[PDB]
PDB file of all heavy atoms in Angstrom:
ATOM      1  N   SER A   1      29.622 -57.361  65.497  1.00  0.00           N
ATOM      2  CA  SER A   1      30.152 -57.347  66.854  1.00  0.00           C
ATOM      3  C   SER A   1      31.392 -58.241  66.899  1.00  0.00           C
ATOM      4  O   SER A   1      31.962 -58.596  65.865  1.00  0.00           O
ATOM      5  CB  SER A   1      29.093 -57.806  67.856  1.00  0.00           C
ATOM      6  OG  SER A   1      28.284 -58.833  67.323  1.00  0.00           O
ATOM      7  N   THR A   2      31.833 -58.602  68.109  1.00  0.00           N
ATOM      8  CA  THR A   2      32.922 -59.570  68.217  1.00  0.00           C
ATOM      9  C   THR A   2      32.439 -60.967  67.845  1.00  0.00           C
ATOM     10  O   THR A   2      33.230 -61.774  67.344  1.00  0.00           O
ATOM     11  CB  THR A   2      33.490 -59.560  69.629  1.00  0.00           C
ATOM     12  OG1 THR A   2      32.414 -59.552  70.584  1.00  0.00           O
ATOM     13  CG2 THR A   2      34.348 -58.323  69.851  1.00  0.00           C
ATOM     14  N   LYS A   3      31.168 -61.255  68.078  1.00  0.00           N
ATOM     15  CA  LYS A   3      30.595 -62.538  67.715  1.00  0.00           C
ATOM     16  C   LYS A   3      30.671 -62.779  66.212  1.00  0.00           C
ATOM     17  O   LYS A   3      31.101 -63.860  65.769  1.00  0.00           O
ATOM     18  CB  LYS A   3      29.141 -62.616  68.201  1.00  0.00           C
ATOM     19  CG  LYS A   3      28.362 -63.841  67.789  1.00  0.00           C
ATOM     20  CD  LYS A   3      26.957 -63.782  68.363  1.00  0.00           C
ATOM     21  CE  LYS A   3      26.021 -64.750  67.671  1.00  0.00           C
ATOM     22  NZ  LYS A   3      24.594 -64.345  67.864  1.00  0.00           N
ATOM     23  N   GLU A   4      30.284 -61.792  65.412  1.00  0.00           N
ATOM     24  CA  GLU A   4      30.353 -61.948  63.966  1.00  0.00           C
ATOM     25  C   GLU A   4      31.810 -61.914  63.485  1.00  0.00           C
ATOM     26  O   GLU A   4      32.179 -62.649  62.560  1.00  0.00           O
ATOM     27  CB  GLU A   4      29.549 -60.858  63.262  1.00  0.00           C
ATOM     28  CG  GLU A   4      28.041 -61.034  63.357  1.00  0.00           C
ATOM     29  CD  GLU A   4      27.484 -60.704  64.720  1.00  0.00           C
ATOM     30  OE1 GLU A   4      27.940 -59.715  65.328  1.00  0.00           O
ATOM     31  OE2 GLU A   4      26.605 -61.452  65.193  1.00  0.00           O
ATOM     32  N   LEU A   5      32.632 -61.078  64.108  1.00  0.00           N
ATOM     33  CA  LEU A   5      34.018 -60.963  63.671  1.00  0.00           C
ATOM     34  C   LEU A   5      34.848 -62.179  64.068  1.00  0.00           C
ATOM     35  O   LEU A   5      35.721 -62.592  63.312  1.00  0.00           O
ATOM     36  CB  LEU A   5      34.642 -59.675  64.230  1.00  0.00           C
ATOM     37  CG  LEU A   5      36.067 -59.335  63.768  1.00  0.00           C
ATOM     38  CD1 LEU A   5      36.154 -59.351  62.250  1.00  0.00           C
ATOM     39  CD2 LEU A   5      36.481 -57.975  64.302  1.00  0.00           C
ATOM     40  N   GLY A   6      34.591 -62.737  65.260  1.00  0.00           N
ATOM     41  CA  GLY A   6      35.309 -63.927  65.672  1.00  0.00           C
ATOM     42  C   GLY A   6      34.991 -65.148  64.823  1.00  0.00           C
ATOM     43  O   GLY A   6      35.869 -65.989  64.593  1.00  0.00           O
ATOM     44  N   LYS A   7      33.750 -65.247  64.347  1.00  0.00           N
ATOM     45  CA  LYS A   7      33.382 -66.347  63.457  1.00  0.00           C
ATOM     46  C   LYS A   7      34.247 -66.345  62.198  1.00  0.00           C
ATOM     47  O   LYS A   7      34.742 -67.385  61.765  1.00  0.00           O
ATOM     48  CB  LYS A   7      31.898 -66.232  63.083  1.00  0.00           C
ATOM     49  CG  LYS A   7      31.462 -67.165  61.962  1.00  0.00           C
ATOM     50  CD  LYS A   7      30.253 -66.613  61.208  1.00  0.00           C
ATOM     51  CE  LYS A   7      29.415 -65.678  62.084  1.00  0.00           C
ATOM     52  NZ  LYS A   7      28.342 -65.012  61.294  1.00  0.00           N
ATOM     53  N   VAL A   8      34.427 -65.166  61.603  1.00  0.00           N
ATOM     54  CA  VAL A   8      35.185 -65.064  60.360  1.00  0.00           C
ATOM     55  C   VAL A   8      36.676 -65.271  60.610  1.00  0.00           C
ATOM     56  O   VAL A   8      37.395 -65.759  59.734  1.00  0.00           O
ATOM     57  CB  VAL A   8      34.886 -63.716  59.674  1.00  0.00           C
ATOM     58  CG1 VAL A   8      35.549 -63.647  58.309  1.00  0.00           C
ATOM     59  CG2 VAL A   8      33.380 -63.532  59.545  1.00  0.00           C
ATOM     60  N   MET A   9      37.165 -64.888  61.787  1.00  0.00           N
ATOM     61  CA  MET A   9      38.569 -65.107  62.113  1.00  0.00           C
ATOM     62  C   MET A   9      38.890 -66.585  62.256  1.00  0.00           C
ATOM     63  O   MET A   9      39.890 -67.084  61.731  1.00  0.00           O
ATOM     64  CB  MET A   9      38.964 -64.340  63.366  1.00  0.00           C
ATOM     65  CG  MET A   9      38.864 -62.821  63.247  1.00  0.00           C
ATOM     66  SD  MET A   9      40.231 -62.093  62.327  1.00  0.00           S
ATOM     67  CE  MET A   9      39.432 -61.717  60.772  1.00  0.00           C
ATOM     68  N   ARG A  10      38.032 -67.318  62.981  1.00  0.00           N
ATOM     69  CA  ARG A  10      38.166 -68.777  63.034  1.00  0.00           C
ATOM     70  C   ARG A  10      38.056 -69.379  61.642  1.00  0.00           C
ATOM     71  O   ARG A  10      38.700 -70.389  61.344  1.00  0.00           O
ATOM     72  CB  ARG A  10      37.109 -69.383  63.956  1.00  0.00           C
ATOM     73  CG  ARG A  10      37.058 -68.824  65.361  1.00  0.00           C
ATOM     74  CD  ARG A  10      36.163 -69.700  66.227  1.00  0.00           C
ATOM     75  NE  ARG A  10      35.526 -68.959  67.304  1.00  0.00           N
ATOM     76  CZ  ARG A  10      35.969 -68.904  68.551  1.00  0.00           C
ATOM     77  NH1 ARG A  10      37.056 -69.562  68.925  1.00  0.00           N
ATOM     78  NH2 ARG A  10      35.303 -68.188  69.450  1.00  0.00           N
ATOM     79  N   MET A  11      37.240 -68.764  60.780  1.00  0.00           N
ATOM     80  CA  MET A  11      37.030 -69.275  59.433  1.00  0.00           C
ATOM     81  C   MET A  11      38.300 -69.228  58.598  1.00  0.00           C
ATOM     82  O   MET A  11      38.403 -69.939  57.587  1.00  0.00           O
ATOM     83  CB  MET A  11      35.905 -68.490  58.760  1.00  0.00           C
ATOM     84  CG  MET A  11      35.370 -69.107  57.484  1.00  0.00           C
ATOM     85  SD  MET A  11      33.935 -68.224  56.846  1.00  0.00           S
ATOM     86  CE  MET A  11      32.712 -68.643  58.096  1.00  0.00           C
ATOM     87  N   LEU A  12      39.292 -68.416  58.981  1.00  0.00           N
ATOM     88  CA  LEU A  12      40.526 -68.262  58.233  1.00  0.00           C
ATOM     89  C   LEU A  12      41.749 -68.348  59.146  1.00  0.00           C
ATOM     90  O   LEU A  12      42.777 -67.712  58.900  1.00  0.00           O
ATOM     91  CB  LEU A  12      40.512 -66.964  57.419  1.00  0.00           C
ATOM     92  CG  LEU A  12      40.060 -65.590  57.934  1.00  0.00           C
ATOM     93  CD1 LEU A  12      40.964 -65.001  59.018  1.00  0.00           C
ATOM     94  CD2 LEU A  12      39.929 -64.645  56.732  1.00  0.00           C
ATOM     95  N   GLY A  13      41.670 -69.157  60.204  1.00  0.00           N
ATOM     96  CA  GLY A  13      42.860 -69.533  60.944  1.00  0.00           C
ATOM     97  C   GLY A  13      42.889 -69.280  62.439  1.00  0.00           C
ATOM     98  O   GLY A  13      42.998 -70.227  63.226  1.00  0.00           O
ATOM     99  N   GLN A  14      42.813 -68.015  62.849  1.00  0.00           N
ATOM    100  CA  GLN A  14      43.154 -67.634  64.209  1.00  0.00           C
ATOM    101  C   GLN A  14      41.917 -67.582  65.105  1.00  0.00           C
ATOM    102  O   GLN A  14      40.781 -67.770  64.665  1.00  0.00           O
ATOM    103  CB  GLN A  14      43.873 -66.271  64.210  1.00  0.00           C
ATOM    104  CG  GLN A  14      44.856 -66.097  63.068  1.00  0.00           C
ATOM    105  CD  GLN A  14      44.440 -65.006  62.124  1.00  0.00           C
ATOM    106  OE1 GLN A  14      43.925 -63.967  62.550  1.00  0.00           O
ATOM    107  NE2 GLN A  14      44.654 -65.222  60.826  1.00  0.00           N
ATOM    108  N   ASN A  15      42.160 -67.316  66.387  1.00  0.00           N
ATOM    109  CA  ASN A  15      41.105 -67.218  67.394  1.00  0.00           C
ATOM    110  C   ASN A  15      41.494 -66.164  68.408  1.00  0.00           C
ATOM    111  O   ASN A  15      42.045 -66.464  69.481  1.00  0.00           O
ATOM    112  CB  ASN A  15      40.859 -68.581  68.067  1.00  0.00           C
ATOM    113  CG  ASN A  15      39.963 -68.478  69.291  1.00  0.00           C
ATOM    114  OD1 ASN A  15      38.835 -67.998  69.205  1.00  0.00           O
ATOM    115  ND2 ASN A  15      40.466 -68.922  70.428  1.00  0.00           N
ATOM    116  N   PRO A  16      41.243 -64.893  68.113  1.00  0.00           N
ATOM    117  CA  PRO A  16      41.603 -63.824  69.045  1.00  0.00           C
ATOM    118  C   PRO A  16      40.636 -63.736  70.217  1.00  0.00           C
ATOM    119  O   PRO A  16      39.504 -64.261  70.181  1.00  0.00           O
ATOM    120  CB  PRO A  16      41.540 -62.544  68.189  1.00  0.00           C
ATOM    121  CG  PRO A  16      41.325 -62.998  66.777  1.00  0.00           C
ATOM    122  CD  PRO A  16      40.751 -64.378  66.818  1.00  0.00           C
ATOM    123  N   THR A  17      41.089 -63.071  71.278  1.00  0.00           N
ATOM    124  CA  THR A  17      40.294 -62.919  72.478  1.00  0.00           C
ATOM    125  C   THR A  17      39.165 -61.915  72.257  1.00  0.00           C
ATOM    126  O   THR A  17      39.218 -61.103  71.328  1.00  0.00           O
ATOM    127  CB  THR A  17      41.174 -62.465  73.650  1.00  0.00           C
ATOM    128  OG1 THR A  17      41.602 -61.105  73.433  1.00  0.00           O
ATOM    129  CG2 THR A  17      42.395 -63.347  73.771  1.00  0.00           C
ATOM    130  N   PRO A  18      38.119 -61.958  73.102  1.00  0.00           N
ATOM    131  CA  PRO A  18      37.018 -60.988  72.961  1.00  0.00           C
ATOM    132  C   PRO A  18      37.427 -59.532  73.190  1.00  0.00           C
ATOM    133  O   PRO A  18      36.598 -58.626  73.035  1.00  0.00           O
ATOM    134  CB  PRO A  18      36.020 -61.442  74.041  1.00  0.00           C
ATOM    135  CG  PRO A  18      36.282 -62.904  74.194  1.00  0.00           C
ATOM    136  CD  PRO A  18      37.785 -63.042  74.038  1.00  0.00           C
ATOM    137  N   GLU A  19      38.687 -59.291  73.546  1.00  0.00           N
ATOM    138  CA  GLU A  19      39.241 -57.941  73.584  1.00  0.00           C
ATOM    139  C   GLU A  19      40.172 -57.638  72.432  1.00  0.00           C
ATOM    140  O   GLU A  19      40.185 -56.498  71.960  1.00  0.00           O
ATOM    141  CB  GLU A  19      39.971 -57.687  74.905  1.00  0.00           C
ATOM    142  CG  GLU A  19      39.088 -57.769  76.134  1.00  0.00           C
ATOM    143  CD  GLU A  19      38.889 -59.187  76.621  1.00  0.00           C
ATOM    144  OE1 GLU A  19      39.707 -60.058  76.262  1.00  0.00           O
ATOM    145  OE2 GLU A  19      37.899 -59.435  77.349  1.00  0.00           O
ATOM    146  N   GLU A  20      40.944 -58.611  71.974  1.00  0.00           N
ATOM    147  CA  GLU A  20      41.653 -58.457  70.705  1.00  0.00           C
ATOM    148  C   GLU A  20      40.679 -58.197  69.564  1.00  0.00           C
ATOM    149  O   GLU A  20      40.998 -57.453  68.631  1.00  0.00           O
ATOM    150  CB  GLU A  20      42.491 -59.703  70.408  1.00  0.00           C
ATOM    151  CG  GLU A  20      43.752 -59.836  71.233  1.00  0.00           C
ATOM    152  CD  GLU A  20      44.220 -61.271  71.356  1.00  0.00           C
ATOM    153  OE1 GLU A  20      44.058 -62.027  70.377  1.00  0.00           O
ATOM    154  OE2 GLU A  20      44.747 -61.643  72.424  1.00  0.00           O
ATOM    155  N   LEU A  21      39.492 -58.790  69.636  1.00  0.00           N
ATOM    156  CA  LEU A  21      38.464 -58.575  68.624  1.00  0.00           C
ATOM    157  C   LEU A  21      37.800 -57.211  68.781  1.00  0.00           C
ATOM    158  O   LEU A  21      37.428 -56.597  67.773  1.00  0.00           O
ATOM    159  CB  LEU A  21      37.417 -59.678  68.703  1.00  0.00           C
ATOM    160  CG  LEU A  21      37.819 -61.063  68.177  1.00  0.00           C
ATOM    161  CD1 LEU A  21      36.843 -62.117  68.668  1.00  0.00           C
ATOM    162  CD2 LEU A  21      37.884 -61.051  66.652  1.00  0.00           C
ATOM    163  N   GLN A  22      37.644 -56.727  70.006  1.00  0.00           N
ATOM    164  CA  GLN A  22      37.115 -55.378  70.225  1.00  0.00           C
ATOM    165  C   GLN A  22      38.128 -54.297  69.872  1.00  0.00           C
ATOM    166  O   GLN A  22      37.729 -53.165  69.605  1.00  0.00           O
ATOM    167  CB  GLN A  22      36.647 -55.235  71.675  1.00  0.00           C
ATOM    168  CG  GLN A  22      35.705 -54.065  71.908  1.00  0.00           C
ATOM    169  CD  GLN A  22      34.356 -54.264  71.245  1.00  0.00           C
ATOM    170  OE1 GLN A  22      33.661 -55.251  71.505  1.00  0.00           O
ATOM    171  NE2 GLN A  22      33.973 -53.332  70.379  1.00  0.00           N
ATOM    172  N   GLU A  23      39.425 -54.625  69.889  1.00  0.00           N
ATOM    173  CA  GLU A  23      40.429 -53.664  69.447  1.00  0.00           C
ATOM    174  C   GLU A  23      40.344 -53.429  67.951  1.00  0.00           C
ATOM    175  O   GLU A  23      40.485 -52.288  67.479  1.00  0.00           O
ATOM    176  CB  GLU A  23      41.819 -54.142  69.837  1.00  0.00           C
ATOM    177  CG  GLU A  23      42.274 -53.708  71.221  1.00  0.00           C
ATOM    178  CD  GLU A  23      43.692 -54.161  71.544  1.00  0.00           C
ATOM    179  OE1 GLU A  23      44.580 -53.967  70.688  1.00  0.00           O
ATOM    180  OE2 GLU A  23      43.910 -54.693  72.647  1.00  0.00           O
ATOM    181  N   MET A  24      40.134 -54.498  67.171  1.00  0.00           N
ATOM    182  CA  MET A  24      39.976 -54.354  65.727  1.00  0.00           C
ATOM    183  C   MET A  24      38.794 -53.462  65.385  1.00  0.00           C
ATOM    184  O   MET A  24      38.858 -52.659  64.444  1.00  0.00           O
ATOM    185  CB  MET A  24      39.816 -55.734  65.074  1.00  0.00           C
ATOM    186  CG  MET A  24      41.123 -56.445  64.750  1.00  0.00           C
ATOM    187  SD  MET A  24      40.836 -58.039  63.968  1.00  0.00           S
ATOM    188  CE  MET A  24      40.735 -59.111  65.401  1.00  0.00           C
ATOM    189  N   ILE A  25      37.701 -53.588  66.137  1.00  0.00           N
ATOM    190  CA  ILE A  25      36.508 -52.804  65.862  1.00  0.00           C
ATOM    191  C   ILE A  25      36.730 -51.341  66.220  1.00  0.00           C
ATOM    192  O   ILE A  25      36.399 -50.431  65.451  1.00  0.00           O
ATOM    193  CB  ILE A  25      35.290 -53.388  66.602  1.00  0.00           C
ATOM    194  CG1 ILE A  25      34.987 -54.795  66.092  1.00  0.00           C
ATOM    195  CG2 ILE A  25      34.085 -52.484  66.463  1.00  0.00           C
ATOM    196  CD1 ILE A  25      33.850 -55.480  66.819  1.00  0.00           C
ATOM    197  N   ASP A  26      37.319 -51.081  67.396  1.00  0.00           N
ATOM    198  CA  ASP A  26      37.524 -49.710  67.845  1.00  0.00           C
ATOM    199  C   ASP A  26      38.542 -48.965  66.974  1.00  0.00           C
ATOM    200  O   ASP A  26      38.586 -47.733  67.038  1.00  0.00           O
ATOM    201  CB  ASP A  26      37.977 -49.695  69.300  1.00  0.00           C
ATOM    202  CG  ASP A  26      36.893 -50.150  70.254  1.00  0.00           C
ATOM    203  OD1 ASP A  26      35.796 -50.515  69.768  1.00  0.00           O
ATOM    204  OD2 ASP A  26      37.120 -50.151  71.476  1.00  0.00           O
ATOM    205  N   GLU A  27      39.346 -49.674  66.187  1.00  0.00           N
ATOM    206  CA  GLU A  27      40.252 -49.015  65.264  1.00  0.00           C
ATOM    207  C   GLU A  27      39.532 -48.337  64.109  1.00  0.00           C
ATOM    208  O   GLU A  27      40.173 -47.567  63.374  1.00  0.00           O
ATOM    209  CB  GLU A  27      41.270 -50.011  64.721  1.00  0.00           C
ATOM    210  CG  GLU A  27      42.602 -50.027  65.463  1.00  0.00           C
ATOM    211  CD  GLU A  27      43.366 -51.332  65.293  1.00  0.00           C
ATOM    212  OE1 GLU A  27      43.586 -51.740  64.140  1.00  0.00           O
ATOM    213  OE2 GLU A  27      43.747 -51.935  66.312  1.00  0.00           O
ATOM    214  N   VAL A  28      38.245 -48.585  63.923  1.00  0.00           N
ATOM    215  CA  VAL A  28      37.501 -48.074  62.774  1.00  0.00           C
ATOM    216  C   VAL A  28      36.094 -47.691  63.176  1.00  0.00           C
ATOM    217  O   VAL A  28      35.247 -47.398  62.310  1.00  0.00           O
ATOM    218  CB  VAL A  28      37.466 -49.112  61.636  1.00  0.00           C
ATOM    219  CG1 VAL A  28      38.825 -49.219  60.959  1.00  0.00           C
ATOM    220  CG2 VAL A  28      37.021 -50.460  62.177  1.00  0.00           C
TER     221      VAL A  28
END
């Protein structure tokens, strides 16, 4: 989800919004 994806994004630098994170998911 965005919860799991946001954890890994913080783990390597950035902190996208709960909609920027949902955009990455909906692309695939």
Side-chain angles (χ1 to χ4, degrees):
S1 36
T2 45
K3 175 179 163 201
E4 287 74 41
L5 186 52
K7 169 206 334 173
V8 186
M9 296 283 106
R10 305 191 209 262
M11 193 174 291
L12 45 67
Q14 321 115 38
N15 170 57
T17 70
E19 297 83 20
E20 285 156 36
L21 286 164
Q22 198 68 57
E23 271 182 47
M24 275 181 270
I25 296 177
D26 292 2
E27 263 157 54
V28 287

